[PDB]
Design a protein around this nucleic acid. Structure first.
Ligand SMILES: Nc1ncnc2c1ncn2[C@H]1C[C@H](O)[C@@H](COP(=O)(O)NP(=O)(O)OP(=O)(O)O)O1
Ligand SMILES: [Mg+2]
Ligand SMILES: [Mg+2]
Length: 341
DNA sequence: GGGGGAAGGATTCT
DNA sequence: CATAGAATCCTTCCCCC
């Protein structure tokens, strides 16, 4: 194929820069405040200014304020960003039928039936980067290659405000040279396992007895890596269908007291049903994060859709099944719905 | 042996 | 100190044939 991947640059923070251009050049930090104490919570993302000082997606806000006490700290306005993304996504649908929207700020475009080589594909990418920059004033990064994974690797390398092709011949090179922990899907727990077997490059998975590989990292990840190593990974650009909807909130204080937890759980069901927007679910899961930050959950599938009134009743049973079977106190509580009609 | 699908946890991603 | 939405995977279990 020919895949052109787009990922928006420091997206939530960049949208706050468009809406308030006096922030450009200072470090901007977009925060998810949790309500326990002043500045409790996590950073959703930060602009590249702030990243230079190690403030980035995932770290505590209190930690970010020690490093960069004079950054701008905004609360996340997810709905604002979703609407700007939808507009950018609508802009991208004008460059192929086949488009896979992979998150709030990425899309894969199968542009095979639309250009014939990589310099065509490179030019279309420059076109895409300029429209997005005219219509919405957002800079993005483009990766182009022969499949989705190496398109995404290409943008990862070219960040930020970049465009990069990985032709067939560097896909061969990267199969030998690229640190395997830079392959999408290889997080920290898989990486150290791969390295405990002396696997550092994609090509290294061809010279291992397969079941040692399957034994350590699981059957699906082994075939995934071997597929890329063999330059035969191909996966279609597909339309993504939302398979679950849910909400999880953080409680002012920890607790395993049912009457104390219920209002948070119930807010989370209420919001999930708004979000459900006429989709009807057969499955419900209750998710708790314990005081030691373990995640535990209890669900149930029904033979029929769940009314709101049933979700309320059943999620209290599933939360009690949690409080029965585990002794830790609860820090975060949420509900998730799946198996729509 | 295996179709199925659950359930609970792990891992990764944004 | 440790947000939040969501997918896919693994293991075990179960319930038939
Ligand atoms: N850990 C997190 N927690 C909450 N929100 C997050 C998050 N990680 C990402 N997001 C939200 C906010 C992120 O902005 C948005 C896009 O995530 P990316 O494309 O992975 N990172 P960005 O676009 O920010 O910078 P780059 O230029 O490096 O892509 O998703
Ligand atoms: Mg991005
Ligand atoms: Mg992204």
């Amino acid at each position: 194929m020919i895949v052109l991947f787009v990922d928006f640059d420091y997206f939530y923070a960049q949208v706050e820069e468009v809406l308030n251009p006096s922030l450009k050049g200072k470090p901007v930090v977009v925060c998810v405040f949790s309500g326990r104490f002043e500045d409790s919570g996590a950073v959703a993302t930060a602009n590249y200014e702030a990243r230079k000082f190690g403030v980035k997606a995932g770290i505590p806000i209190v930690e970010a304020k020690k490093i960069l006490p004079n950054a701008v700290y905004l609360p996340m306005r997810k709905e604002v960003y979703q609407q700007v993304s939808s507009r950018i996504m609508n802009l991208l649908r004008e460059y192929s039928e086949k488009i896979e929207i992979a998150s709030i700020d990425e899309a894969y475009l199968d542009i095979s039936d639309k250009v014939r080589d990589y310099r065509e594909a490179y030019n279309l990418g420059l076109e895409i980067k300029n429209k997005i920059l005219e219509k919405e004033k957002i800079t993005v990064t483009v990766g182009i290659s022969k499949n989705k994974v190496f398109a995404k690797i290409a943008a990862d390398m070219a960040k930020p405000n970049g465009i990069k092709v990985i032709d067939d011949e560097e896909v061969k090179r990267l199969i030998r040279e690229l640190d395997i922990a830079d392959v999408p899907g290889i997080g920290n727990i898989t990486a150290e396992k791969l390295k405990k077997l002396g696997i550092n490059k994609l090509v290294d998975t061809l010279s291992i007895e397969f079941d040692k590989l399957k034994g350590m990292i699981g059957e699906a990840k082994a075939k995934y890596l071997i597929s890329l190593a063999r330059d035969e990974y191909n996966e279609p650009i597909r339309t993504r269908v939302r398979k679950s909807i849910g909400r999880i909130v953080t409680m002012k204080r920890n607790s395993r007291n049912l009457e104390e937890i219920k209002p948070y759980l119930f807010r989370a069901i209420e919001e999930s049903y708004y979000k459900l927007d006429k989709r009807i679910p057969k499955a419900i899961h209750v998710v708790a994060v314990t005081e030691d930050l373990d995640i535990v959950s209890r669900g149930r599938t029904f033979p029929h859709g769940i009314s709101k009134e049933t979700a309320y009743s059943e999620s209290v049973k599933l939360l009690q099944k949690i409080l029965e079977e585990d002794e830790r106190k609860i820090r975060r509580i949420g509900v998730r719905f799946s198996k729509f009609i």
